[PDB]
Design an enzyme around this catalytic site. Structure first.
Site, mmCIF file in Angstrom:
data_model
loop_
_atom_site.group_PDB
_atom_site.id
_atom_site.type_symbol
_atom_site.label_atom_id
_atom_site.label_comp_id
_atom_site.label_asym_id
_atom_site.label_seq_id
_atom_site.Cartn_x
_atom_site.Cartn_y
_atom_site.Cartn_z
ATOM 1 C CB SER A 39 91.269 -50.976 16.969
ATOM 2 O OG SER A 39 91.688 -51.275 18.238
ATOM 3 C CE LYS A 201 90.936 -54.272 13.988
ATOM 4 N NZ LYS A 201 89.939 -53.970 14.992
ATOM 5 C CB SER A 202 85.094 -52.105 14.334
ATOM 6 O OG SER A 202 85.754 -53.078 15.156
ATOM 7 N N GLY A 203 86.922 -49.860 15.565
ATOM 8 C CA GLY A 203 87.650 -49.157 16.598
ATOM 9 C C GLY A 203 86.737 -48.432 17.601
HETATM 10 P P1 LIG Z 1 90.713 -50.784 19.416
HETATM 11 O O1 LIG Z 1 89.689 -51.798 19.567
HETATM 12 O O2 LIG Z 1 89.870 -49.685 19.106
HETATM 13 C C1 LIG Z 1 91.875 -50.636 20.798
HETATM 14 N N1 LIG Z 1 91.066 -50.135 21.870
HETATM 15 C C2 LIG Z 1 91.285 -50.661 23.084
HETATM 16 O O3 LIG Z 1 92.110 -51.519 23.207
HETATM 17 O O4 LIG Z 1 90.574 -50.285 24.176
HETATM 18 C C3 LIG Z 1 89.721 -49.150 24.049
HETATM 19 C C4 LIG Z 1 88.551 -49.239 24.998
HETATM 20 C C5 LIG Z 1 88.750 -49.857 26.269
HETATM 21 C C6 LIG Z 1 87.636 -49.894 27.158
HETATM 22 C C7 LIG Z 1 86.432 -49.304 26.759
HETATM 23 C C8 LIG Z 1 86.251 -48.701 25.532
HETATM 24 C C9 LIG Z 1 87.323 -48.648 24.628
#
Ligand SMILES: *P(=O)(O)CNC(=O)OCc1ccccc1
Length: 257
Positions: A39, A201-203
């Site tokens: 993200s 902005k985290s991910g």
């Molecule tokens: P962003 O927040 O990094 C988009 N990521 C997302 O939508 O899902 C990733 C996810 C799903 C369930 C568990 C861990 C990561």
């Protein structure tokens, strides 16, 4: 604390790239290693749209249909068969990390193709956008799909936001969302000193405990931000990330500035 020592302590891989836009001074750790950005590209996507749509035009609308929805669309889910403004898309994308908002955004810019095009124009031949959300979260240490290096990603943000083509208002609109965003609290915002402002902005990728944080860090008395890219992962597909790793890497990097 040493970055290696953090690797050891938390049993993880760390990629760091930090640029004080004031001095041109860089901090690097595994900055040429590929990591799934997740993200964190919402930031990049968001900036690119904003180079083509002046602030006064964010009132423009896009029609959302059931075909637009992808998982983890806390906001967009309520817009099925409805219209949304470009401004609300961005806010959904940056604040709540809405996957559908990100996708409509990439579409608005014109597709992955156009994103990719734009990146090369910034001299980013590394960042590798291939899939839409949510698939782009399916990371494999064996595929370069939807990965970048801490250094390429970090130079891109700099060219896009920090020293880009954004209008004053757009620049501020984006940055205000990064400041207010409450999702990055345990990350960089938790490692820097009390004094600094943190626009992050985290991910988080699905696999290999792919936990990221990118930020525009403002040391008290500094008006120019430090660009901070922290990409992390582990050895196993099913590993859970520890947020403390990032807070702590942030803290270590702050020391050099
Ligand atoms: P962003 O927040 O990094 C988009 N990521 C997302 O939508 O899902 C990733 C996810 C799903 C369930 C568990 C861990 C990561």
């Amino acid at each position: 604390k040493e970055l290696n020592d953090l690797e050891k302590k938390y049993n993880a891989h760390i990629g760091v790239y930090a640029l004080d836009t004031k001095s041109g001074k860089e901090v690097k750790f595994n900055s040429d290693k590929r990591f799934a950005y997740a993200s964190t590209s919402k930031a990049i996507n968001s900036a690119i749209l904003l180079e083509q749509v002046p602030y006064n035009k964010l009132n423009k609308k896009v029609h959302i249909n059931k075909d637009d929805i992808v998982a983890y669309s806390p906001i967009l889910e309520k817009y099925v068969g409805k219209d949304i403004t470009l401004k609300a898309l961005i806010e959904a994308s940056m604040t709540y990390s809405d996957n559908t908002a990100n996708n409509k955004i990439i579409k608005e810019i014109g597709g992955i193709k156009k994103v990719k095009q734009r990146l090369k124009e910034l001299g980013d031949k590394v960042t590798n956008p291939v899939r839409y959300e949510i698939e782009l979260n399916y990371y494999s240490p064996k595929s370069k799909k939807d990965t970048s290096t801490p250094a390429a990603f970090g130079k891109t943000l700099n060219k896009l936001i920090a020293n880009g083509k954004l209008s004053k208002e757009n620049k501020k609109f984006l940055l205000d969302l990064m400041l207010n965003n409450k999702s990055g609290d345990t990350l960089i915002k938790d490692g820097v000193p009390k004094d600094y402002k943190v626009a992050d902005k985290s991910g988080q990728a699905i696999t290999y405990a792919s936990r990221n944080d990118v930020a525009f860090v403002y040391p008290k008395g500094q008006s120019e931000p430090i660009v901070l890219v922290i990409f992390t992962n582990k050895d196993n597909k099913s590993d859970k990330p520890n947020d403390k790793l990032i807070s702590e890497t942030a803290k270590s990097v702050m020391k050099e500035f």
